[PDB]
Amino acid sequence: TETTEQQRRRYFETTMADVFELDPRKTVRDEYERVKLGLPVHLKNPQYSLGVSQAVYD
Amino acid sequence: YYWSRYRMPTQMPKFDNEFIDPIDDKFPMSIRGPLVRPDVPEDQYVDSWYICTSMTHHMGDYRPWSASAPPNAFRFRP
Amino acid sequence: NVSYWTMNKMVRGGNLLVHRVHYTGWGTDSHLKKGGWEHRWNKVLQRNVLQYSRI
Amino acid sequence: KRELRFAGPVGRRAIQEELQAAELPEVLDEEVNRYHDLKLNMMEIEREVKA
Amino acid sequence: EAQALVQRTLECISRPVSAASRQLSRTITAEAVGLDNAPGHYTNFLEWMGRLTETRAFKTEHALFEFSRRKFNRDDVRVMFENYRLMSKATLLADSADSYSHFYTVLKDFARKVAGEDSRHQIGVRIDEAEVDPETGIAVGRGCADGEKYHFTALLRENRDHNGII
Amino acid sequence: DRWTHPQESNLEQAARGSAVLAKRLSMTVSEMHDRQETAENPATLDRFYY
Amino acid sequence: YEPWEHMKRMGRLVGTGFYIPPEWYNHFRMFPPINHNFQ
Amino acid sequence: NFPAHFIKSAFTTDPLKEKQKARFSSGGEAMREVQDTEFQALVEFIEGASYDQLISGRRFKKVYDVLSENDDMFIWLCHTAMSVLNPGDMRSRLIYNHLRILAESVASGEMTQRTAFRFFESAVRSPAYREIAKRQLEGGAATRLAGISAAADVMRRMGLTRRPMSSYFELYQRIVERSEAMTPWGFPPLFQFEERLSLEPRLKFRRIFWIPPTWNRAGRFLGPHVTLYPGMTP
Amino acid sequence: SNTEHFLDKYEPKRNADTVADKYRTTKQITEIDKWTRYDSARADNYRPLSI
Amino acid sequence: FALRMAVANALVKLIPLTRIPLKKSGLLSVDRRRERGQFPGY
Amino acid sequence: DLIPKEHRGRFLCNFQLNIVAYDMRVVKFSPKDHRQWIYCVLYVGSGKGIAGWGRAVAPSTQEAKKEAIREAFSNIIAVDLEQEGPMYPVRVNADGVRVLLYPARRIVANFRVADILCAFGFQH
Amino acid sequence: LEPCTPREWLQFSHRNLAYAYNGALRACHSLPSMLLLYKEMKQRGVKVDVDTMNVLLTRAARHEHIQVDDVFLLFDELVALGARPDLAAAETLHTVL
């Protein structure tokens, strides 16, 4: 409750820094926006590692 | 009176050869489709009395073909 | 049990509940389509009488 | 602009001195009168109160 | 081998010319447009229009022109309806933010059809799986003729003694 | 003026005014306010083609 | 039914002071319609 | 003779009945008891392919009107007339600016298309324009292609089109029509356009029946759905 | 699939546009369903006790 | 003709690949021709 | 919608209408006489110097009046009101209707034409 | 299109989907897109033909980062799925080897 949304976005980017080989500043940012929107990213991305999936779920 | 039942008036709608609408009837057959009613199972239609058309026993509320066959049925067979 | 004129009048008006079919066919009934008036006659006879044991 | 029009000396002076540097558009009083005289949208009011 | 290799490389590098671009380049001539003594300018215009034909907006406009001319059919209407049903509401808003994306989503494969980019595949007689009885090897067929007068059901089984009859 | 303002009996003018009164009563407050159907502004009752 | 007649009618309509002129009126005052006579 | 039906809704309601009707049915009671135009027209038309609807000509006519309601035909006429001009001649510059103003006014709607066409025909029948077009055609290398391409580009830039990129497809259509040699470049058929605009204010380029027959009206008729000679569906 | 396949090596590189393109068909349930007059006036699927 | 149609359908059900020759020869194509129904007028 | 598009939101004066006459004409869409339409003639004007006249046939009186008003607004014309009238005689022969408009310090005409003069604003 | 009417079921033709997908593969000129479409084809249930195997092999033989072991694995997968190894496919395998 004491961490701002910008901090959460930066933390998500740090967690998923090396998940896309192409443009990170766009790919990871879109991933975070979709996650916060509520899309089934876990269902559509079975290749994600345990840590990445746990971060997305949190 | 007995006839007092048959006195309810219906208000006119509010706007903004014979019997046929030229715009809909003259539409090309190959595009409009050789159909005069929705392609739902024929068990939903009953031949209307005194009228040369077929209405549905359920007012509107059309059910598709997949609503009568088991799920993922082949050719809608049981 | 009405004349042709009376039946036609009652059909053209809303006084009898009948279902219009093709004027030059046999109709919906399978007995009519499979033999005609005589076959439906025989089927009526079979239903009325020729199905009981008649002890 | 309507508030500045109907404000007193001290209040209107404060508004003028605070907005002297803001790049406000040159608005004729007719635009302000039109906007103020436009009637409120009762459907929008209902939507807002329901929300 | 060098001329063959340079020809193959030119063929590979060359961008896929669209059907509309090829049709225009074949029908029009420099004399018709008055650039008879300007081969360079004529070629520049031809390349410009040919590459501009490949954009999504051009395909959407051509598809809508064909739609206005009423050159589609029931299958095309059904495909358009299914394409419209497929896309979601947020996607609908995002594509309508662009001027042509929402139109192209519902006109997809129809702009391709009118541009000729559609695949040329052979559609043959429908082949369905066998409905033979697993326990008896019996296939059932129907035959109807003269309305409700001739109706027959055919049961067919394999004969391994080569003495089959009807 | 006679053509533009057809004469009508009071017993039927009362019915005509009651029709719009009933329509406005059926309408909600927000609908009336948005459509500008008030006691002073006229409100249409029927509009069709035959 | 002439460009000059339309321009003159619009000009004398604007001259009343109770008709906001369209942009094309001043634009055609700047660039008058091409005349067919005087050749 | 003929009984009074009084189909008017204002001739069948009276205050005495309305007094009792209002108490039972009112706005509060009803509330208590009850719970991109081109694209919209297109989706409305194609939703008729649902399992519970039919393809109707009304919706197609509506979408056709929505698609053809523009004046891009007149704008392209003006800019094709402008393309043949010489960007260096002063008379050609005057004609170009006059026609550009005309096209802009048409697009803005400030001038009706009838008077716009009067202006256009008076401008294009002038001897100066005819002489300029004659020189344009006579030249071995001419600027018609560049002029019409720039016309399409300025039509996009100035917002004289229904959609930003429709002008380029219209230019492609213009070129493929120029391949047919219908008319010399810069000499549109004024009589044909006048005939079009006299009628149309805006320049442009098993039966289904809404009333089913009744038994009294039609003696021996079944309906549009019945099949007298059906087949055997697999 | 949850098991890696050798052909998955040659799949197109994950570009942000294509990643955003796989969620286009993901439709919300409120968009999936629609409440109509038939729903409002629907009869009871069981045997009522009183009306 | 009815017997031929029934046998063609049975063959198609048994061996799926036989569908193409019979369909191209029009053996599964039913004709909707029907004799005129009874009518006292004629 | 009565005011045409080119005149939309440009008039600064409140016009007044004057119905000159009504009658009944026959319209024949079919080869035979199709039906009867009311023919209404009217003119709208404001004393500021703007006026127009219209005529229309329609099935109903209100529709005829509306169409005539639309035609009048389409054909509206104006004059310069500085001398409150002309300053030289104008004689026009239109379809045999010989009309003379001349300057005068008073408005002199029969009532039917004086109403038109007041509509245009020609007090002299 | 998924058949939602008996008339559409009369043309569903699960075999003709093979011809449709072969045409689509011949239309697409990019091996990654071709392989994605082939994955959809093989997970949908389409009965793969000899023509789709020929086009897949002739497009995989000419790829920037292709492995011959992977090409042979694709051939074995197609044969196990049900395609018939015709002589054109045999010669393509021969030249790859």
Give the residue on E whose Cα is nearest the Cα of B31.
E73
Q: Report the residue of G5, G10, G18 to disrupt the K interface, i.e. the one with the largest count of K CBs within 10 Å.
A: G18
D-chain CB neighbours of F34 within 8 Å are 41-43
- Chain B interface includes C14 (CB < 8 A): yes
**A34 token code pair:** 């979709």
Q: How far K45 CA sits from the closest chain G CA (Å)?
A: 12
**L87 token code pair:** 């002589």
Give the residue on K whose Cα is nearest the Cα of H108.
K6
Q: Report the residue of E73, E121, E127 to disrupt the L interface, i.e. the one with the largest count of L CBs within 10 Å.
A: E121
Question: Is chain C in touch with chain A: ≥3 Cβ pairs within 8 A?
Answer: no
- Compute CA distances G11 → G26, K43, K47, K122, whole Å: 9, 22, 18, 19
Residues 6+ apart with CB under 8 A from F27: F35, F37, H27
- Compute CA distances A55 → A7, A10, A14, A29, H91, whole Å: 14, 12, 11, 14, 72
The strand pair at K16-27 and E150-157 is best described as: unpaired
- Compute CA distances J3 → C47, E150, E152, whole Å: 34, 9, 7
- Compute CA distances G8 → E58, G2, G12, H209, whole Å: 43, 10, 6, 54
- Number of D/F CB contacts below 8 angstroms equals 10
- Chain B interface includes C19 (CB < 8 A): yes
Q: Are the beta carbons of E73 and B30 separated by less than 8 Å?
A: yes
**L33 token code pair:** 């897109």
Q: How far I13 CA sits from the closest chain L CA (Å)?
A: 9
Which of E142, E149, E156 faces J11 most closely, judged by CB atoms? E156
Q: Are the beta carbons of H110 and K4 separated by less than 8 Å?
A: no
Distance CA D19, CA H29 (A): 52
**D43 token code pair:** 């459907």
- Chain E interface includes B30 (CB < 8 A): yes
**Up-side HSE of residue H75: CA atoms within 13 Å toward CB?**
24
- Chain C interface includes H220 (CB < 8 A): yes
B-chain CB neighbours of H3 within 8 Å are none
Distance CA E157, CA I20 (A): 55
Q: How far C27 CA sits from the closest chain J CA (Å)?
A: 10
- The residue whose two tokens read 């040329």 is E120
Question: How buried is residue H134: exposed, middle or buried, by Cβ count under 10 Å (0-12/13-18/19+)?
Answer: middle
Residues 6+ apart with CB under 8 A from B58: B44
Q: Are the beta carbons of I9 and L33 separated by less than 8 Å?
A: no
**A58 token code pair:** 């949190």
Between CA A17 and CA A25, with CA A23 as vertex, the angle to 5 degrees is 60
Q: Are the beta carbons of I24 and E89 separated by less than 8 Å?
A: no
| Chains touching C by CB (3 or more pairs below 8 Å) | B, H, J
- Chain B interface includes L14 (CB < 8 A): no
- Residues β-bridged to residue H194: none
Q: Is H141 helix (H, G, I), strand (E, B) or coil?
A: strand
What DSSP letter does each residue of E55-120 carry, written as one string?
SHHHHHHHHHHHHHHT---HHHHHHHHHHHHHS-HHHHHHHHHSSSHHHHHHTTTHHHHHHT-S--
Distance CA E19, CA C36 (A): 65
| Chains touching L by CB (3 or more pairs below 8 Å) | B, E, H, I
Q: Are the beta carbons of D43 and F34 separated by less than 8 Å?
A: yes
Residue type, B2: Y
Q: Are the beta carbons of H109 and K4 separated by less than 8 Å?
A: no
Distance CA E114, CA H42 (A): 18
Question: How buried is residue K63: exposed, middle or buried, by Cβ count under 10 Å (0-12/13-18/19+)?
Answer: middle
- Chain E interface includes I30 (CB < 8 A): no
K-chain CB neighbours of G21 within 8 Å are 10
- Residues β-bridged to residue E142: E153
Q: Would you say H124 and H81 are in contact if contact means Cβ atoms under 8 Å apart?
A: yes
H-chain CB neighbours of G24 within 8 Å are 101-102, 104-105, 110-111
Q: Report the residue of C22, C23, C24, C37 to disrupt the J interface, i.e. the one with the largest count of J CBs within 10 Å.
A: C24
Residue whose C-alpha is closest to residue K65's, from F20, F5, F43, F46: F5
- The residue whose two tokens read 């029969």 is K110
Alpha helices of G1-39 — where are they, by DSSP H?
3-14, 23-30
Distance CA K2, CA K8 (A): 9
Give the residue on B whose Cα is nearest the Cα of C10.
B50
Count CB-CB contacts under 10 A for residue H184.
Answer: 13
Q: Are the beta carbons of H39 and E24 separated by less than 8 Å?
A: no
Distance CA E20, CA E26 (A): 10
Question: Which residues of H touch chain L, with CB atoms under 8 Å apart?
Answer: 51, 233-234
Give the residue on F whose Cα is nearest the Cα of D44.
F30
Q: Would you say G25 and H114 are in contact if contact means Cβ atoms under 8 Å apart?
A: no
Q: How far K21 CA sits from the closest chain F CA (Å)?
A: 11
F-chain CB neighbours of H11 within 8 Å are 12, 15
Q: Are the beta carbons of B50 and C14 separated by less than 8 Å?
A: yes
K-chain CB neighbours of G23 within 8 Å are none
Give the residue on B whose Cα is nearest the Cα of C17.
B49
J-chain CB neighbours of E126 within 8 Å are 19
Give the residue on I whose Cα is nearest the Cα of L40.
I1
- Compute CA distances J25 → E144, E151, L15, whole Å: 18, 21, 20
- Compute CA distances D14 → A6, D24, D26, H135, L32, whole Å: 36, 16, 19, 69, 67
- Chain H interface includes F27 (CB < 8 A): yes
Length of chain L counted residue by residue = 97
Count CB-CB contacts under 10 A for residue F15.
Answer: 20
Distance CA L39, CA I12 (A): 13
- Number of G/H CB contacts below 8 angstroms equals 50
Distance CA E154, CA E162 (A): 19
Q: Are the beta carbons of E144 and H232 separated by less than 8 Å?
A: yes
Q: Are the beta carbons of I19 and A21 separated by less than 8 Å?
A: no
- Chain G interface includes H95 (CB < 8 A): yes
J-chain CB neighbours of C22 within 8 Å are 37
What DSSP letter does each residue of L5-62 carry, written as one string?
SHHHHHHH-TTHHHHHHHHHHHH---HHHHHHHHHHHHHHT----HHHHHHHHHHHSS
Which of F18, F27, F28 faces H14 most closely, judged by CB atoms? F18
Give the residue on L whose Cα is nearest the Cα of E79.
L1
Distance CA H234, CA H225 (A): 20
Q: Report the residue of E82, E83, E85, E88 to disrupt the I interface, i.e. the one with the largest count of I CBs within 10 Å.
A: E88
